[PDB]
Symmetry: D2
Subunit: 115 residues, 4 copies
Amino acid sequence: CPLMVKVLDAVRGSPAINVAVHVFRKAADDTWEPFASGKTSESGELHGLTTEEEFVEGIYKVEIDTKSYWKALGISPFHEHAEVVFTANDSGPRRYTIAALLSPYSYSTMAVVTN
Amino acid sequence: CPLMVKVLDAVRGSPAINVAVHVFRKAADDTWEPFASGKTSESGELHGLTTEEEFVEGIYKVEIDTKSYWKALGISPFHEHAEVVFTANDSGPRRYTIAALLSPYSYSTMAVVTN
Amino acid sequence: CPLMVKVLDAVRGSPAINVAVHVFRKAADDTWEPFASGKTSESGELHGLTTEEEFVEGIYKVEIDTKSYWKALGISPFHEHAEVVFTANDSGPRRYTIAALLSPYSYSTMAVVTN
Amino acid sequence: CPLMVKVLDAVRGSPAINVAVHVFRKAADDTWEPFASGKTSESGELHGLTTEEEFVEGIYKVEIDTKSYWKALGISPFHEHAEVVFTANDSGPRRYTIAALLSPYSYSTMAVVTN
């Protein structure tokens, strides 16, 4: 599992559950093609998005549907969604954890790259 | 100014200077049209991107070119850029301050919305 | 003003108003002595805490009373308060801006230091 | 394990390893008494600080020695240390994860409270 996502709720101090996540890879038209997707689990995590063999070097976009999450809670949010765009390269470490901490008018995102 | 951007560097404890910023607006055809662009000043601020008359209801994307910023400092960062996507002015005109706090593997973004 | 504090509310997308702030300085005896205190304005800012003459080299503690702020809004937050502890002016006088971004279960603090 | 700590490095995009952590409980003199301590593991975590039986309701302080961590990396940091102060109460959930994301001039902290 080379790519994991974790999403936390800073209003309730809990994992962000059932949040939809879409992952795209940059195509050589400079166009985003769907790559993987899923919903966060009860621990706010999503793994199993891809495998080592298919996760090749390239530019990836992780899109988190934060607006639906806040509306589900009856909170009016600012952002349409949160996005994380990055390059994956085989030289450096090989396991990627993308974390996102959500508030109605702010978000923070962090990447942990190990091995 | 109805739209302002402020960018800070959490490694040096300073404003992030000469960071390129591009703003887009979602068009009729669901395409991102270029709306305004600029570079942050010595105070890490960008104003004067638009006027209240031109800044109509719509969905906007503020893209902050963080990778060029870190690479010019000698650091290879995780993200390609930081993006903020939001609906603006749908309940009447407002003023928006978009702030971003940057680190090589993390960033935080906050919006302040005033009437 | 050599020491300023700015506090923002990430749930409402606004400055955090009337937040109490207390500043302490570590004394000879390794005790925290009260140094200055105040409340943030309608812009979420506090200035006028000290002068360059009084703001000598030392270790300072800025304590932001976040719990009272959230409780007055109807929310029971995680933290008792946010604290920032730092050495100031040890290489000559500087100006410090301490910013805090607040959510009920999370906060971020940033310092901007200028010569 | 009712209390876990996790510390991440936003400059290197990795766990913060070998960081010292001290935990204090508020005594009825309004004095902080040592409660537990340890160093973060290679995954940036510290568990086993206390047990369900000893972790009773009270006010706790988690102190992370961030200044030594940055100096070990040859980076000049702003803060003397990072502190998290909170009340534990038996009504609500019972498992506490305190996370801290570290930059030289900024830190963010989040609490996840489950069950």
